[PDB]
Amino acid sequence: VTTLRQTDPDFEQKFAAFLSGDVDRAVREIVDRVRREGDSALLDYSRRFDRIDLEKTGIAVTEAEIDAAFDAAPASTVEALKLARDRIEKHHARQLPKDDRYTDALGVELGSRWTAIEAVGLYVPGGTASYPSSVLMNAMPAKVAGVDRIVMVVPAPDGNLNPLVLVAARLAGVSEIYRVGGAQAIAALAYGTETIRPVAKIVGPGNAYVAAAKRIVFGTVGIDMIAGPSEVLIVADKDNNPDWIAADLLAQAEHDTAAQSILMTNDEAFAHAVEEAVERQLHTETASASWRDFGAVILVKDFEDAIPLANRIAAEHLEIAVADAEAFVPRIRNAGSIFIGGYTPEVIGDYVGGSNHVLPTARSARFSSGLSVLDYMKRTSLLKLGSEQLRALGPAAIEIARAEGLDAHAQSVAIRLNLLEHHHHHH
């Protein structure tokens, strides 16, 4: 496994290189066609890519089909999904924003008010990449935020849908479910078709076609972020169970073939002990291809050294397993989620922690946060000036407007001050 040593005269060059790292035309055409033509183009693309005939199966999934999904599900799985839904809901409810209206010293009334986005669409991959936990994580915050209409699009290749996805959808307050995917589904959500009324925002990672479609429609609808390769950074000292740390690195690896698992430690023997555990557990596929191709160990002399390196890696998931861990939490500023101690494997956050696992990937923790209720809401600014306030702030506005050559802007203030001033000749 790749191993970098901070003291190496070439460490910086190798570390920076380690951190570094089309379908546009086809997608541009698919998006434009769905926009201009609607349902018929949706059915057309679904045939080409999902080998399904929506004319016969229908575009929308029925409540009856969702009921059948519930009955087919093992009781313990439905129960587990409900516990996860309940934990996620309670956690997100705490993050609801509070409005703020106040009067400043000049008597100006300033306000901040939050409302939910009216309709939101959740993109959920189809087939073997179709996970019910993803559905709860993406839909529950919208439900908590108060979104009136929650739509889910999920492709059904060869007509197959994971029934657990339908089970999760209901548990999380999803209102409409449509059997479509790819750039065509993204276009339908953004522009609308005869059957699918448009939404105001689309969330949910997808493949290259979905990603390209989202870059196009951004502006017409809001979008969460572009899906990028996932990574876990584990910062651990020798006082850990090597098998446990290995299991955590492998859990992240099975996720995707390009997923990356990094161990940052100050004890080489421990790093060796973790690599041996990774090897044994690897027997007793995607994780194999993932750990070998992208796995890595970074050796530092102490954890003060690990701080700047961890900040540059800016991992989606950061497991901190060192003595006095709570002390490093505030020092490591770039991380989507931080899991503390030996009993908190990243996996728990994917399912039952309650904290949203849909986190920023590919160094995006440098500028973004994981999904929260805020992503499903928006703030409106409120401002009210009375005559006194306009008299006090208007001149400054006029000065700036005129300095900017914006005479109409200056006049909208001057036309008011010119009349008002006749009542202020005393001062």
> Is 256 among the residues that bind Zn ion (CB under 5 A)?
no
Residue 344 CB, shortest distance to its own copies, in Å, is 5
230-259: which residues touch its own copies (CB under 8 A)? 243-244, 247-248, 250-251, 253-255
Write the burial class of residue 48 (CB in 10 Å: 0-12 exposed, 13-18 middle, 19+ buried).
exposed
Contact 370, 95 (CB under 8 A): no
Q: Which residues are the active-site residues?
A: 316-317
| Distance between CA atoms of residues 89 and 336, nearest Å | 19
Contact 356, 370 (CB under 8 A): yes
Q: Is 207 annotated as a binding residue?
A: yes
> Is 387 among the residues that bind its own copies (CB under 8 A)?
yes
Amino acid letter at 11? F
Which of residues 102 and 323 has its CB atom nearest to its own copies in the complex? Answer: 102
Which of residues 304 and 421 has its CB atom nearest to Zn ion in the complex? Answer: 304
Contact 15, 262 (CB under 8 A): no
- Which of 69, 141, 372, 373 forms a contact with its own copies (CB under 8 A)? 372
Size of the site for its own copies (CB under 8 A): 124
166-205: which residues touch its own copies (CB under 8 A)? 200-201
Q: Which helix (H) or strand (E) holds 293?
A: helix 286-294
Q: Which of 280, 381, 356, 364 is nearest to 315 (CA)?
A: 364
> Is 386 among the residues that bind its own copies (CB under 8 A)?
yes
Q: Which of 258, 229, 256, 234 is nearest to 247 (CA)?
A: 234
> Is 110 among the residues that bind its own copies (CB under 8 A)?
yes
Which of residues 173 and 228 has its CB atom nearest to its own copies in the complex? Answer: 228
- Tokens, residue 336: 């989507």
| Distance between CA atoms of residues 145 and 368, nearest Å | 19
Q: Is 350 annotated as a binding residue?
A: yes
Residue 404 CB, shortest distance to Zn ion, in Å, is 10
Which of residues 144 and 359 has its CB atom nearest to its own copies in the complex? Answer: 359
- Which of 304, 399, 404, 407 forms a contact with Zn ion (CB under 5 A)? 304
Q: What is the DSSP letter of 307?
A: H
How does DSSP assign 178-213, residue by residue?
ES--HHHHHHHHHH--SSS---SEEE----HHHHHH
Residue 364 CB, shortest distance to its own copies, in Å, is 7
> Is 276 among the residues that bind its own copies (CB under 8 A)?
no
Reported in sequence order, the residue ranges of 51-161 that DSSP labels E, i.e. its strands, are: 100-103, 109-116, 119-123, 149-153
> Is 151 among the residues that bind its own copies (CB under 8 A)?
no
Choose one: 199-207, 239-247, 278-286, 348-356; the region binding Zn ion (CB under 5 A). Answer: 348-356
Q: Is 409 annotated as a binding residue?
A: yes
Q: Is 123 annotated as a binding residue?
A: yes
> Is 305 among the residues that bind Zn ion (CB under 5 A)?
yes
